[PDB]
Amino acid sequence: DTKISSAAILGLGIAFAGSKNDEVLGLLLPIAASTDLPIETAAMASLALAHVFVGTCNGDITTSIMDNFLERTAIELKTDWVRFLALALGILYMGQGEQVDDVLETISAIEHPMTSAIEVLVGSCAYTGTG
Secondary structure (H helix, E strand, O other): OOOHHHHHHHHHHHHHHHHOOHHHHHHHHHHHOOOOOOHHHHHHHHHHHHHHHOOOOOHHHHHHHHHHHHHOOHHHHOOOHHHHHHHHHHHOOOOOOHHHHHHHHHHHHOOOOOOHHHHHHHHHOOOOOOO
16 A cells, blocks of 8 residues: 555655755755665655656756656666656746757767657657747
8 A cells, every 4th residue: 555665755755745845956056966775765755856846847857857767777767757857857947048059968878768758758848939
């Protein structure tokens, strides 16, 4: 039903309201980058983080979320966390931004799996003209 860990995060998700503190952002990021521990748990943490910054914006969060995008271990054979991970990347730039063009440009630089699919997704959600 609900893992003891999942429940703990739940209540914590409610308190995450103050997450708008360079303190929580400094702790979540490192844990969101998943330097080793399964990315599964990181996905949950990164989720709540957004629920908070869902109003504000920051390039830092993307930093941690980016490092993980490349750190994607064979564990990528899944099909669910990516849909959410990519969704959070689009919400951070809901108001569009030339940056989006810069980020994607980086992905194209480095050869990656069918990930190209996502590149086209976030690539569509931007300037209503795209050059």
